[PDB]
């Protein structure tokens, strides 16, 4: 715990499809949530999952 | 746990087979007491059984299309497959695994179901679409894009000022139609120069319309 | 052929329950098991209460099946509503020939904001449009918060079933659904015919909007 706030500890969310036991993610691709996906920075319902 | 994972082209064209195949991981498909099944989910509409088959060889098919539907499992590879046959415009769809219980005195949920795939018919590969201005009647106004062939679509209102884009839907023909639209105060604010360009993504082509 | 049939559209304010029931027609439902499936938009279907009566574990106890046998239906009870209880729920049983039947769907949501009337934008073909030998009649219908979205086509005196392409609930920039009543007609129907109306009808209330050369 630090006073000025954590920003080295990340987590994904909202992954497409459950993960298998024992299995890690790297690529950090932002996640598409919605029918349209976004190519470049995130945006509605295409936000980024760390 | 067990998952299914779908596997098989993501697009195809009528006239033709719709194969695909689920990979299923965490589980024995040669196991029994459990259907291997495929469900179908028009976009905008309900779920639609297709048919489920045991490991016996036993299939159990839909009385609506059961003359164009086959199912095969492997118990080496742990891979059950549907096979189409004669696809049309209509049967672009999510296709679903599932795996049903047959455990206890009748048939069950689809306990595990799979991630989902999402593939489309249609024959065309390539395709220009054509801009239509939209006259308003507070008033609406906008752009009427018809008859492009990719999926991913480029909205562009007044060079970036701004929307509610209206995503387009698979329509008899086998394509899209995007209407996207702005709102104005008054039919005076609708003099101004009002530019509605979209870019074709998979060409790097675009196109421009002056609307008022 | 055993069918299932559930409301289309089920909307009600928070912490208070809400009722999703599917009715066998041509056939009973006390002979096949009646399974509910919440299907998140944009994600796989859940069960969250299969053989009637049990919920599987993980899924909260808000949910609840019941079965009446007097009026051949299957309800859902859902007490307390919550933010993610937002998704589809799908009613699913068998035929006696060993044949899945799903449900209509039915789309739950829980009253956020107050809810709001419904707004009509009959567009006639345009100049361009008309050229290119095509009309593309379309009701961008917005401004209204449940996803009621229906859409019934009308032509001056006859019905209108051929063409219908409306797309899924989209939201807008500022928090609010709203949707396109597509449809393609020969130009020399609409030269022939008077006028056509696009009939919404969201939330009970028949909003109509006719539009005329």
């Known amino acids: 715990s630090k006073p000025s706030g954590n920003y080295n500890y990340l987590y994904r969310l909202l992954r497409k499809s459950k993960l298998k036991p024992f299995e890690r993610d790297i690529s950090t691709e932002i996640y598409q949530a919605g029918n349209k996906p976004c190519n470049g920075v995130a945006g509605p319902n295409c936000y980024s999952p760390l | 746990q067990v998952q299914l994972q779908e596997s098989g082209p993501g697009l195809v064209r009528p006239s033709q087979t719709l194969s695909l195949t689920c990979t299923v991981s965490?589980?024995?498909?040669?196991?029994?007491?459990?259907?291997w099944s495929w469900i179908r989910q028009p976009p905008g509409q309900g779920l639609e059984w297709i048919g489920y088959?045991?490991?016996?060889?036993?299939?159990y098919y839909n009385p609506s299309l059961k003359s164009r539907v086959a199912i095969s499992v492997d118990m080496s590879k742990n891979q059950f497959s549907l096979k189409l046959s004669s696809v049309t415009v209509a049967d672009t769809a999510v296709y679903y695994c599932?795996?049903?219980?047959?455990?206890?005195?009748?048939?069950?949920?689809?306990?595990?179901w799979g991630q989902g795939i999402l593939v489309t018919v249609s024959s065309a590969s390539t395709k220009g679409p054509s801009v239509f201005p939209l006259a308003p009647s507070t008033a609406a106004l906008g752009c009427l894009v018809k008859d492009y062939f990719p999926e991913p679509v480029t909205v562009s209102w007044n060079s970036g000022a701004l929307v509610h884009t209206f995503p387009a839907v698979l329509q008899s023909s086998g394509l899209y139609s995007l209407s996207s639209v702005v709102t104005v105060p008054s039919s005076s604010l609708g003099t101004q120069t009002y530019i509605c360009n979209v870019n074709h993504k998979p060409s790097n082509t675009k196109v421009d319309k002056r609307v008022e | 052929e055993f069918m299932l049939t559930q409301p289309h559209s089920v909307s009600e304010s928070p912490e208070m329950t809400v009722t999703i029931s599917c009715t066998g027609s041509?056939?009973?439902?006390?002979?096949?098991?009646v399974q509910w499936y919440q299907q998140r938009p944009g994600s796989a279907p859940t069960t969250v209460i299969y053989?009637?009566?049990?919920?599987p574990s993980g899924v909260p106890n808000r949910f609840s099946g019941s079965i009446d046998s007097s009026s051949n239906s299957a309800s859902l009870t859902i007490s307390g509503l919550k933010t993610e209880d937002e998704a589809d729920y799908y009613c699913?049983?068998?035929?006696?020939?060993?044949?899945?039947?799903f449900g209509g769907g039915t789309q739950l949501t829980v009253l956020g904001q107050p809810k709001a009337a419904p707004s009509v934008t009959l567009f006639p073909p345009s100049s361009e449009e008309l050229q290119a030998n095509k009309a593309t009649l379309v009701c961008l219908i917005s401004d209204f918060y449940p996803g009621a979205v229906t859409v019934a086509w009308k032509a001056d005196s006859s019905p209108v079933k051929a063409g219908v392409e409306t797309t899924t609930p989209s939201k807008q920039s500022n928090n609010k659904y709203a949707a396109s009543s597509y449809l393609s007609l020969t130009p020399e129907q609409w030269k022939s015919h008077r006028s056509y109306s696009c009939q919404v009808t969201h939330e009970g209330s028949t909003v109509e909007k006719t539009v005329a050369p």
């Open positions: 053989e009637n009566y049990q919920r």
């Open positions: 599932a795996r049903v219980d047959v455990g206890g005195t009748l048939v069950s949920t689809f306990d595990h």
């Open positions: 088959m045991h490991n016996s060889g036993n299939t």
């Open positions: 041509s056939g009973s439902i006390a002979d096949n098991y």
């Open positions: 699913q049983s068998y035929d006696n020939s060993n044949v899945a039947v």
């Open positions: 965490g589980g024995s498909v040669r196991n029994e007491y459990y259907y």
